[PDB]
Write a protein that binds this ligand. Structure first.
Ligand SMILES: N[C@@H](CCC(=O)O)C(=O)O
Ligand SMILES: N[C@@H](CCC(=O)O)C(=O)O
Ligand SMILES: [Zn+2]
Ligand SMILES: [Zn+2]
Ligand SMILES: [Zn+2]
Ligand SMILES: [Zn+2]
Lengths: 258, 258
């Protein structure tokens, strides 16, 4: 009777509490998505157990074995019932799983160390002094791999061959690299993560330029799940009653440090 | 399958949320006891529904009809399964219901408007310029009614006959009366409520002297309930893991205004 909710350790969506060692189950974790999962489960009327995705990935299909990994894989293969995470709504995923209407809007964005002479993707593409990269897996990397726009094709060509590799395993690693590189590394990531980091000490990063696209995160379920409808209606209610905005303020801005 | 939890509207234990009009069920309320009920239900493993006691009372037995009113009555007559509230552990109640070990320690205390020339119960008892009273019903009034200590007998004799009546219907009314009386009214109430008000604007009240007694609030259940053991063990765990102290800080001090 207990619904398995897959999620991913990513600040400020899901994080361990300070004393998690003496805590069990859902209590171990806190964050925006922990709060959102509680709200969904309240309104859908289900008991639930949070489960951190074993492989720490969002979800992509292996071109060789055709196997889905990450949170998407957990849903595809029936190991989880719902995903509550900053999981981007994309065509290739919508082909295999279902998504609620968006609970958060975002776009791909550029993170620089303050003072770096870059104001747009065009600025990055036309030079080589400042390296740039994305998460080693995820919808951002796929944006560049799949683009047919000249500027982004140029960026993908550079990123694919750059050494040392410009691809990072986690968002935190990419951020660390921006901070430690004296302005010679810029990180391509979602505007939501960018905005969060901008409000954290040492306050040495910034989001520059407009977003490169417009999309959203959705709460995901397996195709044909009997929970899809109620989850979607819950998300819409939470939006219209101002909860989603409240939670965004709680985890991004109310706690700000800059 | 849903356990009925009786409680009482008393700040900061239980209060309506700003938007309660668009909210249903437990979501309507917030406060220390709302948080405590959630924690108890999590650890005891039950679904639950908060229910504000209809008559707004804590619990006393009518000397005429022998009927128990308030939250105690809800438990005695089977209309609620648990009470989570600032309900004082007393002999006469322990005769009819069960209580967990204390989740909060307290004592009877004196609230004055700042500048009032009173430092103890003795100071109040020996004069008449400054009126004083208690909640019109509850364990504090019963303390004075039942005492055989000369000072408290003197106070009860005064309070019983004073006009205009010195007894108030709610804690809030007693507080208002202290604030509006230019130092000519002092209010006898539990140290917990006193400490809370002391940290609220206009910051014009204070707790004076030591406490008159030492007791505790407990989570209550009907005699012989199958939930009594697990509730008691939950309360002890919450105490030992520092949750109770955290919640006290959250609702009394972290939000302070003085
Ligand atoms: N939200 C992305 C992960 C982060 C990124 O790609 O930058 C996804 O669902 O794959
Ligand atoms: N906690 C008290 C109510 C407040 C008071 O008596 O001052 C009771 O359980 O009756
Ligand atoms: Zn750990
Ligand atoms: Zn809600
Ligand atoms: Zn109302
Ligand atoms: Zn707990």
């Amino acid at each position: 009777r207990t619904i398995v909710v897959t999620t991913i350790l990513e600040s400020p969506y899901v994080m361990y509490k300070k004393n998690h060692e003496q805590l069990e189950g859902n209590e171990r974790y806190e964050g925006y998505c922990v709060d959102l999962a509680y709200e969904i489960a309240k309104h859908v009327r289900i008991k639930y157990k949070l489960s951190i995705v074993g492989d720490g990935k969002y979800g992509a299909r292996d071109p060789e074995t055709k196997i889905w990994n990450g949170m998407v894989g957990e849903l595809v293969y029936g190991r989880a019932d719902i995903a509550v995470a900053p999981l981007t709504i994309t065509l290739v995923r919508e082909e295999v799983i279902d998504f609620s209407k968006p609970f958060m809007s975002l776009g791909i964005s550029i993170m620089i160390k303050k003072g770096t002479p870059i104001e747009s993707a065009e600025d990055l593409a036309k030079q080589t002094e400042i390296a740039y990269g994305t998460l080693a897996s995820g919808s951002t990397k796929e944006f560049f791999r799949r683009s047919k726009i000249a500027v982004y094709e140029k960026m993908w060509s550079y990123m694919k061959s750059a050494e040392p590799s410009v691809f990072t395993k986690t968002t935190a690693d990419g951020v660390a690299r921006v901070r430690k590189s004296k302005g010679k590394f810029a990180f391509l990531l979602e505007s939501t993560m960018n905005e969060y980091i901008e409000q954290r000490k040492p306050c040495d990063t910034m989001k520059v330029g407009g977003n490169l696209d417009s999309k959203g995160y959705g709460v995901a379920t397996p195709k044909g799940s009997a929970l899809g409808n109620a989850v979607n209606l819950a998300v819409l209610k939470l939006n219209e009653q101002g909860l989603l905005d409240k939670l965004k303020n709680k985890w991004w801005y109310d706690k700000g440090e800059c």
